[PDB]
Design a binder for this molecule. Structure first.
Ligand SMILES: Cc1ccc2c(c1)CC[C@@H](C(=O)Nc1nnc3n1CCCC3)O2
Length: 167
């Protein structure tokens, strides 16, 4: 039993809710919140910009030190950093950005990072400003993630389309 509330169950391990991931994280304080990161951990907009804003830019400060030490992530890769006031940890995961021409096949690799954590609060990878089809992202999530994932979808219209079209 966990404290996630109001989710629709899609499969044995995948759950979904129309919610602002920032507000969900502040309420639940999950062990892991997933960020929709880019390889430079520049959290300018989309989910990343919103999560970082909620940390009063502390996420960005920590991320800049991470990059200065380690260099950029790989597309499809991840790193674990602090969750600040939102969660114990933040798993920064880089899905492919279609608006940069990146290989959508890397979306499965991106979701594989979730399997290193027993329970996660997450957005749909590569959705939103990353330009992929969110219906496809949900399909890859369900077919790749085996751990318990609670998906937050900000847009109510999109949430209803994702549920109604789910196979
Ligand atoms: C030609 C073409 C037309 C429409 C279209 C796509 C492509 C790809 C993605 C899709 C989409 O819904 N993306 C998305 N993911 N999170 C959100 N949105 C949009 C609305 C709010 C939040 O829409």
């Amino acid at each position: 039993v966990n404290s996630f509330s109001g989710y629709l169950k899609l499969t044995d391990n995948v759950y979904i809710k129309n919610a602002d991931i920032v507000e969900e994280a502040k309420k639940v304080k999950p062990t892991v919140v997933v960020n929709a990161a880019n390889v430079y951990l520049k959290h300018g907009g989309g989910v990343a910009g919103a999560l970082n804003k909620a940390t009063n830019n502390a996420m960005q400060v920590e991320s800049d030190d991470y990059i200065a030490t380690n260099g950029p992530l790989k597309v499809g890769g991840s790193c674990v950093l602090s969750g600040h006031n939102l969660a114990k940890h933040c798993l920064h995961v880089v899905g492919p950005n279609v608006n940069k021409g990146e290989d959508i096949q890397l979306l499965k690799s991106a979701y594989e990072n979730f399997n290193q954590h027993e329970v996660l609060l997450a957005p749909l990878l590569s959705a939103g400003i990353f330009g992929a089809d969110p219906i496809h992202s949900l399909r890859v999530c369900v077919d790749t993630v085996r751990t318990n994932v609670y998906l937050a979808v900000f847009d109510k219209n999109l949430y209803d389309k994702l549920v109604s079209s789910f196979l």
